[PDB]
């Protein structure tokens, strides 16, 4: 994978600032603006029950991994056109590596 590795500590601060307002990560995490991200890796897009996805998010049907997640978090609406995730994007490779590293631990 072209995804190296970052700091799970930096990723933690990156998630609480740029992700937490819409996403929870722990098991039994409540569906807010965005769906609960627990176990998001190893799962196709738009398949967490209880949450109401867009049709484009479901039809994307992408098996999430560290690599396609990097594409998605760079520019959410270009990787998946029609998505309702209002997010500018992680335009820095370090922030991507740092956050994905944190998410992997949190999504366990």
């Amino acid at each position: 994978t072209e995804f190296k590795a970052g700091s799970a500590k930096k990723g933690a601060t990156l998630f609480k600032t740029r992700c937490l307002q819409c996403h929870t990560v722990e098991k039994g995490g409540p569906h807010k603006v965005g769906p609960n991200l627990h176990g998001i890796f190893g799962r196709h897009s738009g398949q967490a029950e209880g949450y109401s996805y867009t049709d484009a998010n479901i039809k994307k049907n992408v098996l999430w991994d560290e690599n396609n997640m990097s594409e998605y978090l760079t520019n959410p609406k270009k990787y998946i056109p029609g998505t309702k995730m209002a997010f500018g994007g992680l335009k820095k490779e370090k922030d991507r590596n740092d956050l994905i590293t944190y998410l992997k631990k949190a999504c366990e």
Binding site: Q21, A86, G88, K91
Partner: protein
Amino acid sequence: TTPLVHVASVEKGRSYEDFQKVYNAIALKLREDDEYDNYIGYGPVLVRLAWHISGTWDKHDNTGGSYGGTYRFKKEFNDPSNAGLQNGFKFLEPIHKEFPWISSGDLFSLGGVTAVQEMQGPKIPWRCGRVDTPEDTTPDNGRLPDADKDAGYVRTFFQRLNMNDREVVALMGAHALGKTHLKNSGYEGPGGAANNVFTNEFYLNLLNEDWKLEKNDANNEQWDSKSGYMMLPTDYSLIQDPKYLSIVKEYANDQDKFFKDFSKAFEKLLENGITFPKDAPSPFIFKTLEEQGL
């Protein structure tokens, strides 16, 4: 005698490409300095900057307005209602150093235009030609709106900016951006979950969130939600007024309508008090960094 007339004077030898480079300079630093204000970015404060430098205008005598760029003087710089905008000026300072030919007015308003577009907002036409004016032209403090009022105050205040009911509801949607800081305004919290991407969230959250009037740690009163969002007393007065309410519901279901209406009212705000000659260049519409392949 007739009051002052501010004629748009194009920067000597400058055209669209030159101003596009200033746009890119602002847009790039927006990406680099992405960790500001807990990763909110310099976006919101830059449009707040453009609004406060244009919101000093008085239609009755054409005093104030963004033309003079008089915010560069201490009298306006240290306005109690302008607390926190120093971060915005400091942001544009290296950009002004890189393009010393641009006027302060043109630079401040362009910063306003640039971040809205970069935050995936609507395209906002922008016109150059503003000219710096002496320190004596700097308007007195107290020309900026008060947060702890009602709908009647808001409508009356914006009469001085030649804004109508439809114009102020669209402009107020910018309060979905960033947040209020206690050490700046005396109010605390964001207005939604998405405050660095330009959407119609301000109108949705105003209608779909349950608000309760409380008292924060600065003894001031603000509307708070269970989700953790906040609204100023003036913001909340938009769903209190039946005419404002109708327009709020409109922009809530139609972000497209909101974008086009904001783009109009925002440009008019930045150009209030400026006379554009017949020979003046048509308004500029700069392509985003994303539209530049970045």
